[PDB]
Protein backbone atom coordinates (compact mmCIF):
# COMPACT_ATOMS: atom_id res chain seq x y z
CA UNK A 1 0.00 0.00 0.00
CA UNK A 2 2.31 2.86 -1.31
CA UNK A 3 0.85 6.19 -0.95
CA UNK A 4 1.76 9.62 -0.42
CA UNK A 5 0.52 13.25 0.34
CA UNK A 6 1.58 16.77 -1.44
CA UNK A 7 1.09 19.97 -1.01
CA UNK A 8 2.50 23.31 -3.78
CA UNK A 9 1.59 26.44 -4.47
CA UNK A 10 -0.15 28.39 -6.77
CA UNK A 11 2.89 29.20 -8.72
CA UNK A 12 3.37 28.25 -12.83
CA UNK A 13 6.87 26.75 -11.71
CA UNK A 14 5.54 24.19 -8.70
CA UNK A 15 2.39 23.21 -11.04
CA UNK A 16 5.04 21.78 -13.40
CA UNK A 17 7.09 20.27 -10.76
CA UNK A 18 4.40 18.74 -8.59
CA UNK A 19 2.32 17.20 -12.09
CA UNK A 20 5.92 15.78 -12.50
CA UNK A 21 6.67 14.23 -9.57
CA UNK A 22 2.97 13.04 -9.23
CA UNK A 23 2.73 11.14 -12.31
CA UNK A 24 6.18 10.15 -11.84
CA UNK A 25 5.10 8.44 -8.72
CA UNK A 26 1.49 7.10 -9.68
CA UNK A 27 3.60 5.39 -12.75
CA UNK A 28 5.56 3.62 -9.71
CA UNK A 29 2.34 2.32 -7.92
CA UNK A 30 1.77 5.29 -5.46
CA UNK A 31 -1.63 6.76 -4.57
CA UNK A 32 -0.81 10.38 -5.00
CA UNK A 33 -2.70 13.67 -2.79
CA UNK A 34 -1.91 17.03 -3.80
CA UNK A 35 -3.24 20.19 -2.72
CA UNK A 36 -2.55 23.71 -3.95
CA UNK A 37 -2.23 26.04 -1.14
CA UNK A 38 -0.62 29.36 0.08
CA UNK A 39 2.75 29.87 0.95
CA UNK A 40 2.85 30.06 4.44
CA UNK A 41 0.22 27.39 4.74
CA UNK A 42 1.78 24.64 2.60
CA UNK A 43 4.56 24.93 4.98
CA UNK A 44 2.65 24.94 8.09
CA UNK A 45 0.63 21.82 6.95
CA UNK A 46 4.21 19.87 6.55
CA UNK A 47 5.47 21.41 9.98
CA UNK A 48 2.07 19.77 11.64
CA UNK A 49 2.82 16.35 9.97
CA UNK A 50 -0.43 16.82 7.96
CA UNK A 51 1.43 16.54 4.33
CA UNK A 52 4.47 14.31 3.52
CA UNK A 53 6.22 17.18 2.07
CA UNK A 54 6.74 19.47 -1.11
CA UNK A 55 9.51 20.08 -3.51
CA UNK A 56 8.61 24.35 -4.05
CA UNK A 57 10.93 25.39 -0.68
CA UNK A 58 12.83 28.86 -2.75
CA UNK A 59 15.90 29.08 -0.06
CA UNK A 60 17.93 30.76 1.28
CA UNK A 61 16.52 33.90 1.16
CA UNK A 62 12.88 33.30 -0.93
CA UNK A 63 11.48 31.83 2.22
CA UNK A 64 13.43 32.84 4.53
CA UNK A 65 10.39 34.39 7.21
CA UNK A 66 8.90 30.37 6.83
CA UNK A 67 12.33 29.06 7.41
CA UNK A 68 12.87 30.37 10.74
CA UNK A 69 9.51 29.97 11.82
CA UNK A 70 8.52 26.27 10.83
CA UNK A 71 12.48 25.08 9.94
CA UNK A 72 12.76 23.55 13.19
CA UNK A 73 9.65 21.18 12.29
CA UNK A 74 10.40 19.85 8.95
CA UNK A 75 13.23 18.08 7.69
CA UNK A 76 15.20 19.78 4.38
CA UNK A 77 16.09 17.11 2.01
CA UNK A 78 17.96 20.00 0.15
CA UNK A 79 18.04 21.40 -3.56
CA UNK A 80 15.94 19.74 -6.40
CA UNK A 81 16.52 22.89 -9.09
CA UNK A 82 19.76 24.24 -9.16
CA UNK A 83 20.32 28.09 -10.06
CA UNK A 84 17.18 29.67 -9.25
CA UNK A 85 16.21 33.84 -9.53
CA UNK A 86 13.91 36.41 -7.82
CA UNK A 87 14.18 39.77 -9.23
CA UNK A 88 12.89 43.01 -10.59
CA UNK A 89 12.18 42.18 -14.27
CA UNK A 90 11.48 44.87 -17.26
CA UNK A 91 11.30 44.98 -20.83
CA UNK A 92 14.31 44.61 -22.85
CA UNK A 93 13.47 48.04 -24.08
CA UNK A 94 13.55 49.77 -20.94
CA UNK A 95 16.26 52.15 -20.42
CA UNK A 96 17.34 51.11 -17.13
CA UNK A 97 19.47 48.44 -16.56
CA UNK A 98 19.78 48.77 -12.47
CA UNK A 99 17.82 48.96 -9.35
CA UNK A 100 19.65 52.16 -8.45
CA UNK A 101 19.35 53.56 -11.20
CA UNK A 102 14.79 53.55 -11.03
CA UNK A 103 13.49 56.80 -10.28
CA UNK A 104 10.26 58.01 -11.75
CA UNK A 105 9.09 55.15 -14.63
CA UNK A 106 6.33 53.34 -14.17
CA UNK A 107 4.39 55.50 -11.84
CA UNK A 108 6.89 53.94 -9.33
CA UNK A 109 5.24 50.80 -8.96
CA UNK A 110 6.01 47.21 -8.57
CA UNK A 111 3.93 45.15 -10.13
CA UNK A 112 3.67 42.51 -7.68
CA UNK A 113 1.67 38.63 -7.17
CA UNK A 114 -0.52 37.48 -4.19
CA UNK A 115 0.95 39.14 -0.77
CA UNK A 116 2.04 36.47 0.52
CA UNK A 117 4.94 34.99 -1.91
CA UNK A 118 8.32 35.05 -0.86
CA UNK A 119 9.32 37.43 -3.25
CA UNK A 120 7.01 40.35 -2.13
CA UNK A 121 8.57 40.18 1.17
CA UNK A 122 12.10 40.44 -0.41
CA UNK A 123 10.72 43.29 -2.48
CA UNK A 124 9.63 45.36 0.27
CA UNK A 125 12.96 44.57 1.92
CA UNK A 126 14.17 46.02 -1.48
CA UNK A 127 11.74 49.33 -0.79
CA UNK A 128 13.48 49.92 2.17
CA UNK A 129 17.07 49.61 1.18
CA UNK A 130 17.69 51.63 -1.35
CA UNK A 131 17.02 55.44 -1.32
CA UNK A 132 15.90 55.93 -4.75
CA UNK A 133 13.43 53.77 -4.08
CA UNK A 134 11.57 56.03 -0.92
CA UNK A 135 9.09 57.20 -2.92
CA UNK A 136 8.36 54.08 -4.48
CA UNK A 137 5.34 51.03 -3.67
CA UNK A 138 4.63 47.57 -4.07
CA UNK A 139 1.11 46.77 -5.99
CA UNK A 140 -0.12 43.28 -4.89
CA UNK A 141 -1.92 41.38 -7.22
CA UNK A 142 -1.45 37.67 -8.32
CA UNK A 143 0.98 35.14 -10.47
CA UNK A 144 -1.60 35.09 -13.72
CA UNK A 145 -2.66 39.22 -12.80
CA UNK A 146 1.31 39.69 -13.19
CA UNK A 147 1.74 37.84 -16.53
CA UNK A 148 -1.32 39.47 -18.08
CA UNK A 149 -0.30 43.15 -17.19
CA UNK A 150 2.97 42.51 -18.53
CA UNK A 151 1.69 41.25 -21.71
CA UNK A 152 -0.67 44.91 -21.91
CA UNK A 153 2.17 46.73 -20.67
CA UNK A 154 4.45 45.47 -23.79
CA UNK A 155 1.90 45.65 -26.30
CA UNK A 156 1.41 49.28 -25.83
CA UNK A 157 5.40 49.78 -25.04
CA UNK A 158 5.03 51.27 -21.55
CA UNK A 159 7.30 51.09 -18.83
CA UNK A 160 6.47 48.39 -15.98
CA UNK A 161 8.68 46.58 -13.35
CA UNK A 162 7.40 43.18 -12.24
CA UNK A 163 8.53 41.19 -9.04
CA UNK A 164 9.86 38.01 -12.11
CA UNK A 165 11.76 34.79 -11.21
CA UNK A 166 13.23 31.85 -12.89
CA UNK A 167 12.68 29.21 -13.93
CA UNK A 168 9.45 31.07 -15.76
CA UNK A 169 8.03 30.99 -19.25
CA UNK A 170 7.89 34.36 -20.06
CA UNK A 171 11.72 34.83 -20.68
CA UNK A 172 10.83 32.59 -23.79
CA UNK A 173 7.74 34.71 -24.80
CA UNK A 174 8.88 38.28 -24.08
CA UNK A 175 12.08 40.06 -24.30
CA UNK A 176 12.97 40.57 -20.94
CA UNK A 177 15.80 41.45 -18.37
CA UNK A 178 16.53 41.23 -14.89
CA UNK A 179 17.69 44.64 -13.06
CA UNK A 180 20.38 44.20 -10.96
CA UNK A 181 20.85 44.10 -7.71
CA UNK A 182 24.18 45.36 -6.09
CA UNK A 183 22.81 45.28 -2.39
CA UNK A 184 21.29 41.31 -2.65
CA UNK A 185 18.33 42.01 -1.14
CA UNK A 186 16.44 40.43 -4.17
CA UNK A 187 18.11 37.24 -3.25
CA UNK A 188 21.94 36.35 -4.78
CA UNK A 189 22.11 32.15 -4.51
CA UNK A 190 18.91 30.42 -4.79
CA UNK A 191 17.49 26.80 -4.86
CA UNK A 192 14.42 25.14 -5.30
CA UNK A 193 14.28 22.70 -2.43
CA UNK A 194 12.55 19.73 -1.24
CA UNK A 195 11.03 19.37 2.36
CA UNK A 196 9.70 16.74 3.97
CA UNK A 197 7.58 15.66 7.22
CA UNK A 198 9.33 14.75 10.61
CA UNK A 199 8.97 11.18 10.62
CA UNK A 200 8.37 10.39 7.16
CA UNK A 201 11.88 9.14 6.96
CA UNK A 202 10.82 6.02 9.46
CA UNK A 203 6.99 6.02 8.70
CA UNK A 204 7.09 6.01 4.97
CA UNK A 205 10.42 4.89 3.87
CA UNK A 206 9.63 4.31 0.28
CA UNK A 207 8.27 7.98 -0.41
CA UNK A 208 11.11 9.38 1.50
CA UNK A 209 13.36 8.25 -0.89
CA UNK A 210 11.12 9.03 -3.94
CA UNK A 211 11.17 12.52 -2.54
CA UNK A 212 14.62 13.02 -1.29
CA UNK A 213 16.39 11.68 -4.92
CA UNK A 214 14.51 13.73 -7.11
CA UNK A 215 15.86 16.47 -9.28
CA UNK A 216 15.75 18.02 -12.40
CA UNK A 217 16.91 21.27 -14.62
CA UNK A 218 15.75 24.87 -15.51
CA UNK A 219 14.89 23.64 -18.78
CA UNK A 220 13.10 20.67 -17.78
CA UNK A 221 10.56 22.88 -15.73
CA UNK A 222 10.52 25.42 -19.00
CA UNK A 223 9.67 22.52 -20.51
CA UNK A 224 6.71 21.17 -19.02
CA UNK A 225 5.68 25.04 -18.31
CA UNK A 226 5.62 26.09 -22.06
CA UNK A 227 3.04 22.77 -22.55
CA UNK A 228 0.97 23.81 -20.02
CA UNK A 229 1.10 27.69 -21.64
CA UNK A 230 -0.05 25.76 -24.91
CA UNK A 231 -2.89 24.07 -23.97
CA UNK A 232 -1.86 21.06 -22.51
CA UNK A 233 -2.93 19.66 -19.16
CA UNK A 234 -0.36 20.02 -16.47
CA UNK A 235 -1.38 15.71 -16.43
CA UNK A 236 -0.03 15.10 -20.26
CA UNK A 237 2.45 17.85 -20.00
CA UNK A 238 3.95 16.07 -17.04
CA UNK A 239 3.32 12.80 -18.82
CA UNK A 240 4.90 14.13 -22.32
CA UNK A 241 8.08 15.04 -20.33
CA UNK A 242 8.62 11.95 -18.71
CA UNK A 243 8.38 9.76 -21.90
CA UNK A 244 10.95 12.30 -23.22
CA UNK A 245 13.50 11.79 -20.44
CA UNK A 246 12.34 8.38 -19.05
CA UNK A 247 15.49 7.09 -17.91
CA UNK A 248 16.97 10.45 -15.84
CA UNK A 249 12.95 9.73 -14.10
CA UNK A 250 13.81 5.93 -13.44
CA UNK A 251 16.53 7.28 -11.36
CA UNK A 252 14.01 8.59 -8.61
CA UNK A 253 12.69 5.62 -7.89
CA UNK A 254 16.02 2.94 -7.19
CL1 LIG B 1 16.58 16.85 -2.48
CL1 LIG C 1 8.21 33.86 2.69
Request: glycine residues 6%.
Amino acid sequence: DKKVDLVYMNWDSEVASINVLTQAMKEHGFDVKTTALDNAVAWQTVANGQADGMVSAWLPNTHKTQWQKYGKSVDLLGPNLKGAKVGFVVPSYMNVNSIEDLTNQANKTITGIEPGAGVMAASEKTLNSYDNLKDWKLVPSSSGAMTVALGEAIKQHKDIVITGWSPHWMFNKYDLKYLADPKGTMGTSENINTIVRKGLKKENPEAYKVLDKFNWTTKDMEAVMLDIQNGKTPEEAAKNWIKDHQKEVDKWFK
